[PDB]
Ligand binder design. Sequence first.
Ligand SMILES: CCCCCCCCCCCCC/C=C/[C@H](O)[C@H](N)CO
Lengths: 240, 175, 249, 249, 249
Amino acid sequence: QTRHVIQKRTRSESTVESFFARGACVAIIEVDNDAPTKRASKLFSVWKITYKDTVQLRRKLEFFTYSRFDMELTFVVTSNYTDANNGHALNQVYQIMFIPPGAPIPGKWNDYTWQTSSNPSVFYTYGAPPARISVPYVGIANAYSHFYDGFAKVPLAGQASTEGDSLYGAASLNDFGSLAVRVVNDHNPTKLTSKIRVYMKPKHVRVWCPRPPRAVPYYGPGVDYKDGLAPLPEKGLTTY
Amino acid sequence: RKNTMDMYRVELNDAAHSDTPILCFSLSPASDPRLAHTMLGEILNYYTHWAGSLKFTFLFCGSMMATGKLLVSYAPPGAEAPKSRKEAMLGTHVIWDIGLQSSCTMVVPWISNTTYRLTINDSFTEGGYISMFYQTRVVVPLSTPRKMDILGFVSACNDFSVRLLRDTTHISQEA
Amino acid sequence: QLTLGNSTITNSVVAYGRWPEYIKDSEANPVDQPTEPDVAACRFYTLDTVTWRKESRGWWWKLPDALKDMGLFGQNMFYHYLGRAGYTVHVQCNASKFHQGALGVFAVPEMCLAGDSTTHMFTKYENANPGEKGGEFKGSFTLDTNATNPARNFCPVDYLFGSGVLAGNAFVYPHQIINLRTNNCATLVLPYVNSLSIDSMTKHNNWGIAILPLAPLDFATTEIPITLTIAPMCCEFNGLRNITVPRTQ
Amino acid sequence: QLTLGNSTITNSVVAYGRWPEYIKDSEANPVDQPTEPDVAACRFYTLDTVTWRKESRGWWWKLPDALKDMGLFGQNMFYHYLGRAGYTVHVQCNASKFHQGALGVFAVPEMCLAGDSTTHMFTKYENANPGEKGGEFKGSFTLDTNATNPARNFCPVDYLFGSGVLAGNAFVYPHQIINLRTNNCATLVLPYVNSLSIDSMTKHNNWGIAILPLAPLDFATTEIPITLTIAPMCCEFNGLRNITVPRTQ
Amino acid sequence: QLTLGNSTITNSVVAYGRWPEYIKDSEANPVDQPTEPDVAACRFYTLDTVTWRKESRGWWWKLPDALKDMGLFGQNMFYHYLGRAGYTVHVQCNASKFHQGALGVFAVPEMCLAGDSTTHMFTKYENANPGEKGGEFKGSFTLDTNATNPARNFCPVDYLFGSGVLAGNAFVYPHQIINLRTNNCATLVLPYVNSLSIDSMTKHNNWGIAILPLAPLDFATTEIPITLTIAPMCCEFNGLRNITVPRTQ
Ligand SMILES: CCCCCCCCCCCCC/C=C/[C@H](O)[C@H](N)CO
């Protein structure tokens, strides 16, 4: 038997919007401001845009099969000296250029591509609050596909083994381009190292076809597993 | 059995009646190991606070010729966890006739001192105990399997809610 | 009694409460006139029967891959760049009142399966698309160590549901339980589920069917057959050209 | 599905067509405010299970004696001079389709039982009130010849229904038959039956439950359990004081 | 003349001007049907009488701890996970017109008391819940230096009101003064005060009763008894299961 309870609890914080209403670190892009001839300093870094370099946001997203959302990107930039015996540096400015698929990838930190006449670029000044941009839903499909049970190519009879071979589960449905990051400043006498942490927040989220969450450690961009295949601990059947 | 399919199966047999439990587990849907990795547990492990009733369904997977009655009990916390059917029957409970219905659902109603329980093992917000016992016994005729399996399922009722989004301990990244 | 075309079958789950339907004019991406073979292809095809034993770990099929050699449906699938279909999946498994056991039949959208190698996403097309024979789940994971001639096959572990998730949670997918003491069949009605209105049937498998023994088969003394009968529904095809002939083996 | 308080049970006889009810103001003898624990005491309690064998002669319990140690109902019973309750008695006995046998479950108002001695009415309180364990009927009457330490116990003979009446006529009492080929349970709803509106629960047992094998248990090869689940109903208590502690053994 | 159940008593303070009341449907956290024993438990129980001497420093009790062994109230308290009750506390202390002295009777919500050790919050459950006997305040603080077998008890200093606050300010709590020249009794009506609608009675003491000699007892020649009579009010209980049996001593 039960009594009458005027329930007041709501599910406001468990809406799909609220569940994803957080900035999650999806990448740590390392760049160096240094003399070009050092050959150990990366004067620019190219990171392919994805949520699969980290696990937390990946697991939350992969609770579902399909998603549709706008994205907010927040860039937190940290920098430090690498040695103390080569003087100091002036405040650095960073270029973060979005290179959509097909646009020329920079080959050098100061090549023509950084003119960014058509690529969106964010110039961030060190010490300023973390840079932020928004993008709408840009999928070429009607939703993003977290899982694609297929191939980009179908091998055909009479084709050699090398031909028609494509990775399982790899489709251009998630080809979103890259971010190219450089320090715009010419080098100081001392080497400086910077990290740009990219934080992703889905907004106006819609999701479809829920899935059981990842239970074993992720292994690659796919659903493959190799290690940690025993997540359940030991517990007696009649032990409270 | 852990980390195999066998971990989902609880074996009943046709032995003589006893009052000892078939299975026992605590009502900690986010932190009890049997419940933590259920879909409900997985969702709750992204939240700090939870409240509401739970549904525990049990499916009997023996032969059609098997008969029996079981007792499924929820004991609110604060007392010794039911060691036998005599104690368990004092709490909330349901009698399940496996011959009649292969599936039995027991609703564990929300009963708590706090308006929300934590999603960790916590004495102050402990949720109580769930146990299963033989009411009479499993009976089979000849030429019938004398051992069979039952399966347990858990879900949240429509009054269930969670609060205080948090990161889960169920996924980690190395290096 | 469920009838489609010339086929008749004599408990039922509509996945996501959505019956299969044709593309609405407001959702149609391709502009050419679609092909709608209707009864000639929208009919029940019976796959090769598999055997449930005490030691069986499970079975899996991919749709439309499992039907690629099913008469006119297969012909239309391989003659068109684009194809769309829902399904009616009818799993048939009868036993005596003295048998026991339970099967979980799960229809999984985008049922990606884990590989067998340290190389990511390395399962080749031939193994990922076995056809009507489908594949089987394994008890444990066996890494393929052959470097010269890698198997490049799935290694789907049963308790990981073949994709690194606990099998107990696979009930979040549309599903039906065949409990031998209660029923001998499961019917799942699957709408076309995809991020596109229509896609390439040969490139992409929209649905996976996973049958796992939730309770092992037992009999007082045993093996019983399981038969899948699948009817594609609301079929549409676009982009007619010469027939696709996928590489095999 | 019958629910009382926190207890649920999932053919039914209302004794004398009278549902249990509370004392009407026009029938209330005591003047103090009654105690009505409701769900805390009005709930199903499961007694210790007994075993039906081929040789079993029968079983008997007394109400409210059988529930005297059942949580808050027992506490209220022993803390009050006066108590009143109906009951829901649920006898549970399942077997296979290949078993046979029948039980007569009789609810008897004022179920007085015959003694075991030449001294009349000599059964002592401890033996007349065995509690949840109840007692068993015998095949024949055995006079207790021990003069030094007389057993002073009941000797209820089955075919005499334990009280010198033919068992075949016990069907005049409210009853239900559990025929293993037809049903596995019996439900008897007993109103409070007494010559008073309310009485002393410790002094007086309002109801007796007698379970007799009308057809002996048989199986082609056997023992099957019988479980009693009794919920007191419409409980009222009066005359609160220090707890009664009856002498035992 | 104040009557509750079968108990009658023949200046009065309602703590915070709030009479005890039952949980409103709009404030009820638990969903199961509450148990409301009413008169059987909502009645005056008389605790063991204490002795006021010239040297007495004070006395303290915890509610519901002081009533845990009080008949059906104690039974309901230990049989339920959740319990809620207000109280009527009646302190009785009569003397002659030639006696003098004054008692401050304070009802303190969440009356936490200081320990006796350098280890914080180290008072064990048995000592924190003495039952009807309660405890006494001390004149000074004595640190417990026994490392092998620490007393793990309260050391409540009277002028610190047992919790590190000046006793003179304890009048901010609901209180009554028994001034022997004016009155011989104090009545405090305490509503259920807590941060929850209902809580565990065994885990949590909602109220503390502190009786301090504001003016020492004196007589021209002396000891006089003090008797506490406490009735729980508007009792509600939830979460019935097997009885809790707390560890003692
Ligand atoms: C000023 C240039 C830098 C700012 C522009 C950043 C470009 C972002 C465009 C790509 C959009 C990616 C959206 C998220 C990709 C995820 O893999 C999918 N949403 C997965 O569901």
